[PDB]
Nucleic acid binder design. Structure first.
Lengths: 50, 69, 97, 85, 154
RNA sequence: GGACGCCCUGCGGCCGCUCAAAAGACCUGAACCCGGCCGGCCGCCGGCCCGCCGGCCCCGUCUCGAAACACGGACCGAGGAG
RNA sequence: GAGGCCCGCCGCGGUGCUGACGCGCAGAUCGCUCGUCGGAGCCGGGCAUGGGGGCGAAAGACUCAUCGAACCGCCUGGUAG
RNA sequence: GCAGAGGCCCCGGGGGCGAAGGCGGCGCGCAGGCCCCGCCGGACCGGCCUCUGGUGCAGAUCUCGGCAGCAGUAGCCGCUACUCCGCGCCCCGGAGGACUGAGGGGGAGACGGGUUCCGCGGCGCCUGCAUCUGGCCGCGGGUGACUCGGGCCUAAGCGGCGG
RNA sequence: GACCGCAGCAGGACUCCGGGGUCAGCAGCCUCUAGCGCGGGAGCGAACGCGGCUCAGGGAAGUCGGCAAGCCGGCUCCGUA
RNA sequence: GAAUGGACCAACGAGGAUCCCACUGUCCCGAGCCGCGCCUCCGCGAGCCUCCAGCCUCGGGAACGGGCGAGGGCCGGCCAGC
RNA sequence: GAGACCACCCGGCGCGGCGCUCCUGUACGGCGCAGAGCCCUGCGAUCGCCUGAGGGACGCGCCUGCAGAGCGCGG
């Protein structure tokens, strides 16, 4: 892992970037009512690439 | 800011497909400055962070002030 | 507050473990304000933060026992738990002779 | 021993991401995608699992070229064909 | 629609709390014990239960509750000293007494606890790991506490 | 999508507010199940003013024969088979 | 200063208590006790051998908690006096 | 009895002057069942004739969803251990007493995870007690190489080769 | 201390550096450095269980079998069928 | 019963037996003690089971019933054990 | 004196002292014409004396001292 490949580092990077909650303004714009990303992951429970 | 003042180094996010020779030439052409060294890392978020150390004669504080840093 | 950042920073500056770092019981607010190695170095010069000595084990009893074993006081058959060959090897004695 | 202790010895990646299909199905020792079929020219498509065919097939993705061409044939590609013919 | 005690022109102050994170069993008994007591006696009873001087008698949920010396005159040998429940009940009975003083200008002395209704609520559902790789539940038993204060019986 | 006032260390509560209605994180809101209060002490069937007398084994099922120390069935709702 | 030598540490095995555990710490653990410990030793990484096949100091053992023939999908809503 | 279809319901069937549904109480029918009244509800609904069927449940170690009594019960039994005082939390600081005991409950790598790292704030969740704690939540950052490793060489092996 | 076992699972999982005393020891027992006070607290001092400790006199009569415990044990010198 | 090997045991063996010494709660014959769990409290809080129902004696009966026939017992609610 | 919890038997408790008695076995220290010896006139395991001492106690007696009996709940 410390000796990561570039391809692997870039796929893992997107997961950190997309691990974000719905922006509060987007909930107001879309009148979403349900307020949770669901695609969000936690390092201990998630098994990315498994 | 401490890096720009003491180590004369401007840190700049660059394209990841770019290379240290290309970053040095590009910074020199756009900012009209001389660059002694470039050191670069690809951030955990995928972006490429390039530490451009300006030549000792050039002062990075002046170049940063023109940039808006 | 949680001065665990300041016992980590002072351990680095004093080059000792965080179990040796001692803060003044007073001036706790001054320790709380410091959050940088330089603002920790200032409190070390002030002596608000200090390190303890290594405080290892006394060898006073050990140097007395070795001194009396030099006289022969503590090495009788009861105190010998190893073979005479293990204690002093015959090969070593032959090689020296 | 058969299970929990032996599961402790699990610390390697048998499979990796496929270049063609981006799934954790490229075997790293044998160099073959279990789902994609890579390194083969043809894709691995089996009619025993129609559910597998439905998960990756034409229309699952953008279909950016085909959509464009289909609309153009329903517009001005047919005319360009007759002009060439 | 949340209050059981339907008022009948009695000018009685009311307070409540919903989804209280306490035991339902150990809060129902605390409220049952304070019923019929002047709010001054109830505040000193609940304080005594915390200092362990007095005991909450358990009349309904008594299986596994120890018989104690303090429960001699309660009518049941069994009794306990719930601490989380007493804290919660005291807050509701302080709000109820405050509401009745402001709304009808009653005096604390002439206010008596008249009615209560502790209902079971939906609980946080944590999990419990059993042997042979099995997962069970560690669900809480929260309660909807309702305390009413009023003039006195008859 | 909750006016105002009253309170609370606060949490939160009470008044009420908007609305036709809280319909308040949501339409109706059953059963099981449970808490308050009031009434009784109680299964079913029959008789009577109504707690007494009389009768009454647990169904479904294969089976010669099941209350069976044969088997399935905690409970309730929905789905469920010419 | 020899040895598939002996005692004994980690290691590697796993004898007995027919101990604890048995709605476990745990879908094989925990405690003592024990076999061995320079060797047909032990351990990590890479690699090869694939299902009536492999591999086996042989126990029909082992092959991802699955083995006197793995798992996945399909035939298949197989058939059943 | 159920659900739909084709007709009927004499001025064109019953409905916000309250439909279906739900709840309690009658009445009628040997019974399946029907009908009315009150209350909740808030927009649809039938009688009769002909037609159609994925048309009626107490069971299937029945499927799915809720959920009871057990029951405040079983349990929260490893790794020696905490105490005093102070914004006083199992936070933190000082002071006592301990422990892991250099094949460490020490400091580092390989792999595997993939941001868990760090600072600031927070406790709605999780931390099977608590929390002012945190690996948790929010926000803003963080990995710099001519000399280290990849890359490069070959090993066991594997791919390629007119064919 | 974040990996893999449903879990912040008395379960596993590769290495590198390795102070002092007692000692033949990298054993056991304490300690320097460093780390640190583990899915919780009190009260009581029942039976019973578990992990121990001791027991007069006898000594396996117990039991399927001495199971379990206990005895023995380090070094030096004798003395060995 | 003789390389489906016969006979033979030096050295070995967490192999299977017999005895002797030594040794001890194995036992005669149990007793006291120390921790921890238990128990009581505070905070958390399951699983499993379940037609109902949970006192007996006899008789009949699918020949061994809580429920049936006949007697005899029985406030009701819990707790620690078992 | 009784106990898992309760209950039971008793209650101005109880805490800290002082005696008595008993347990262990002669305390630290000082001293000595004790001490094998040694090398220094110092060291030294020990020994005697003070010292049936000291330390201890959950048993008995006593208090010289702080205390101690609810305006708590029922009723």
């Amino acid at each position: 892992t410390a000796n990561k490949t570039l391809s692997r580092k870039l796929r893992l990077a997107k997961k950190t970037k997309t691990n974000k909650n719905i922006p509060r303004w987007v909930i107001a714009k879309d009148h979403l009512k349900k307020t949770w990303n669901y695609k969000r992951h936690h390092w201990r429970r998630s098994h990315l690439k498994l | 800011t401490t890096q720009i003042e003491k180590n004369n180094t401007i840190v700049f996010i660059v394209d990841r497909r770019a290379s240290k020779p290309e970053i040095r030439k590009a910074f020199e052409t756009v900012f009209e400055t001389k660059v002694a060294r470039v050191n670069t890392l690809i951030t955990p978020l995928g972006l490429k962070k390039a530490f451009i150390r300006l030549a000792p004669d050039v002062q990075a504080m002046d170049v940063a002030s023109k940039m808006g840093l | 507050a949680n001065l665990r950042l300041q016992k980590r920073l002072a351990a680095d500056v004093l080059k000792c473990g965080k179990r040796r770092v001692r803060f003044n019981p007073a001036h706790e607010k001054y320790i709380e304000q410091a959050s940088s190695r330089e603002a920790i170095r200032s409190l070390i010069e002030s002596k608000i933060i200090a390190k303890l000595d290594i405080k290892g084990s006394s060898r006073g009893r050990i140097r007395a026992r070795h001194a009396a074993k030099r006289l022969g006081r503590h090495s009788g058959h009861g105190k010998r738990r190893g073979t005479r060959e293990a204690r002093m090897p015959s090969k070593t004695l032959w090689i020296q002779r | 021993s058969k299970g929990t202790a032996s599961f402790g010895k699990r610390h390697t990646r048998i499979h990796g991401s496929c270049r063609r299909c981006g799934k954790h199905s490229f075997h790293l020792q044998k160099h073959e995608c279990a789902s994609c079929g890579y390194p083969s020219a043809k894709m691995r498509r089996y009619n025993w699992s129609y559910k597998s065919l439905r998960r990756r097939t034409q229309g699952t993705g953008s279909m950016s070229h085909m959509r464009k061409v289909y609309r153009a044939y329903n517009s001005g590609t047919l005319k360009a064909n007759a002009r060439k013919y | 629609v949340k209050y059981a005690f339907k008022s009948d022109n009695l000018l009685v102050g009311k307070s409540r709390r919903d989804g209280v994170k306490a035991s339902f069993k150990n809060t129902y008994s605390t409220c049952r014990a304070i019923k019929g007591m002047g709010v001054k006696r109830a505040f000193a009873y609940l304080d005594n239960v915390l200092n362990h001087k007095e005991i909450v008698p358990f009349f309904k949920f008594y299986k596994g509750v120890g018989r104690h010396s303090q429960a001699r005159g309660s009518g049941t040998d069994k009794g306990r000293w719930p601490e989380k429940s007493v804290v919660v009940v005291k807050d509701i009975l302080k709000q109820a007494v405050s509401n009745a003083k402001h709304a009808h200008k009653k005096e604390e002395d002439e206010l008596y606890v008249i009615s209560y209704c502790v209902n079971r609520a939906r609980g946080r559902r944590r999990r419990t790991f059993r042997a042979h790789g099995r997962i069970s539940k560690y669900e809480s038993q929260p309660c909807h506490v309702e305390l009413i204060v009023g003039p006195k019986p008859l």
